[PDB]
Design an enzyme around this catalytic site. Structure first.
Site, PDB file in Angstrom:
ATOM      1  N   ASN A   1      -8.198   8.424  -5.906  1.00 28.82           N
ATOM      2  CA  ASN A   1      -8.953   7.366  -6.575  1.00 28.82           C
ATOM      3  C   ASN A   1      -9.861   7.956  -7.601  1.00 28.82           C
ATOM      4  OD1 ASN A   1      -9.075   6.242  -3.416  1.00 28.82           O
ATOM      5  ND2 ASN A   1      -7.933   5.328  -4.979  1.00 28.82           N
TER       6      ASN A   1
ATOM      7  N   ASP B   1     -12.967   7.751  -8.080  1.00 34.73           N
ATOM      8  CA  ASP B   1     -14.195   8.302  -7.549  1.00 34.73           C
ATOM      9  C   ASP B   1     -14.012   9.625  -6.839  1.00 34.73           C
ATOM     10  OD1 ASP B   1     -14.732   6.299  -4.583  1.00 34.73           O
ATOM     11  OD2 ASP B   1     -13.078   7.517  -5.094  1.00 34.73           O
TER      12      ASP B   1
ATOM     13  N   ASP C   1      -6.721   7.941  -0.714  1.00 32.06           N
ATOM     14  CA  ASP C   1      -6.200   6.968   0.249  1.00 32.06           C
ATOM     15  C   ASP C   1      -4.985   7.584   0.997  1.00 32.06           C
ATOM     16  OD1 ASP C   1      -6.311   4.413  -2.292  1.00 32.06           O
ATOM     17  OD2 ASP C   1      -7.874   4.994  -0.808  1.00 32.06           O
TER      18      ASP C   1
ATOM     19  N   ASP D   1     -15.156  -4.774   9.574  1.00 27.03           N
ATOM     20  CA  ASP D   1     -16.335  -4.348   8.743  1.00 27.03           C
ATOM     21  C   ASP D   1     -17.080  -5.495   8.045  1.00 27.03           C
ATOM     22  OD1 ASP D   1     -17.443  -2.731   5.878  1.00 27.03           O
ATOM     23  OD2 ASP D   1     -17.927  -1.840   7.899  1.00 27.03           O
TER      24      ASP D   1
ATOM     25  N   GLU E   1       0.829  -1.242   0.000  1.00 25.00           N
ATOM     26  CA  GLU E   1       0.000   0.000   0.000  1.00 25.00           C
ATOM     27  C   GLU E   1       0.861   1.290   0.000  1.00 25.00           C
ATOM     28  OE1 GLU E   1      -2.974   0.074  -0.725  1.00 25.00           O
ATOM     29  OE2 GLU E   1      -3.956  -1.698   0.049  1.00 25.00           O
TER      30      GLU E   1
ATOM     31  N   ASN F   1      -9.051   4.867   2.991  1.00 27.49           N
ATOM     32  CA  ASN F   1      -9.799   5.700   2.022  1.00 27.49           C
ATOM     33  C   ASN F   1     -10.817   6.668   2.630  1.00 27.49           C
ATOM     34  OD1 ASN F   1     -12.634   5.329   0.764  1.00 27.49           O
ATOM     35  ND2 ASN F   1     -11.118   5.667  -0.863  1.00 27.49           N
TER      36      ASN F   1
ATOM     37  N   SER G   1     -12.225  10.042  -4.147  1.00 29.77           N
ATOM     38  CA  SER G   1     -11.820   9.867  -2.745  1.00 29.77           C
ATOM     39  C   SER G   1     -10.253   9.782  -2.784  1.00 29.77           C
ATOM     40  CB  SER G   1     -12.417   8.560  -2.143  1.00 29.77           C
ATOM     41  OG  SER G   1     -11.965   7.411  -2.847  1.00 29.77           O
TER      42      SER G   1
END
Ligand SMILES: [Cl-]
Ligand SMILES: [Cl-]
Ligand SMILES: [Cl-]
Ligand SMILES: [Cl-]
Ligand SMILES: [Cl-]
Ligand SMILES: [Cl-]
Ligand SMILES: [Cl-]
Ligand code: NA
Ligand code: NA
Ligand code: NA
EC number: 3.2.1.17
Length: 129
Positions: free
Chosen positions: A46, A48, A52, A101, A35, A59, A50
């Protein structure tokens, strides 16, 4: 801050990540390697809109607030800037919520594609822990 491999494993272990939700230390260090290359200052935008952040590339769509991800949540209740600190406490605390999650470490696409099912203990091999 750019961590050394063993240095990051020790810090993750001190913050309780070793075997958290059943994921051994090597899984976390592997995920951090892919990462962010162990760099707490890593950021990636990203598609979209967003972004990270940090060693585990957390994110802003769900987990932290950056003020610029429309319709997003801040489930860890932190500004995304906190995930870039030399002190990995916020990153670890938040990663605990993300791994809990439902999809386990699959939440991290790079963990699924590059760590899952590999010899992750190699990531902690030779470290004093
Ligand atoms: Cl390495
Ligand atoms: Cl391991
Ligand atoms: Cl936002
Ligand atoms: Cl929220
Ligand atoms: Cl904030
Ligand atoms: Cl730390
Ligand atoms: Cl799981
Ligand atoms: Na963003
Ligand atoms: Na992070
Ligand atoms: Na957000």
């Amino acid at each position: 801050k750019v961590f050394g491999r063993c240095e990051l494993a020790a810090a993750m272990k001190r913050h309780g990540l070793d075997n958290y939700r059943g994921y051994s230390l090597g899984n976390w260090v592997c995920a951090a390697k892919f990462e962010s290359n162990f760099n707490t200052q890593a950021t990636n935008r990203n598609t979209d809109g967003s972004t990270d952040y940090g060693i585990l590339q957390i994110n802003s769509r769900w987990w932290c607030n950056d003020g610029r991800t429309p319709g997003s949540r801040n489930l860890c209740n932190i500004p995304c800037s906190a995930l870039l600190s030399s002190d990995i406490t916020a990153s670890v605390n938040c990663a605990k919520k993300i791994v809990s999650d439902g999809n386990g470490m699959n939440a991290w696409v790079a963990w699924r594609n590059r760590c899952k099912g590999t010899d992750v203990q190699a990531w902690i091999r030779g470290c004093r822990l």
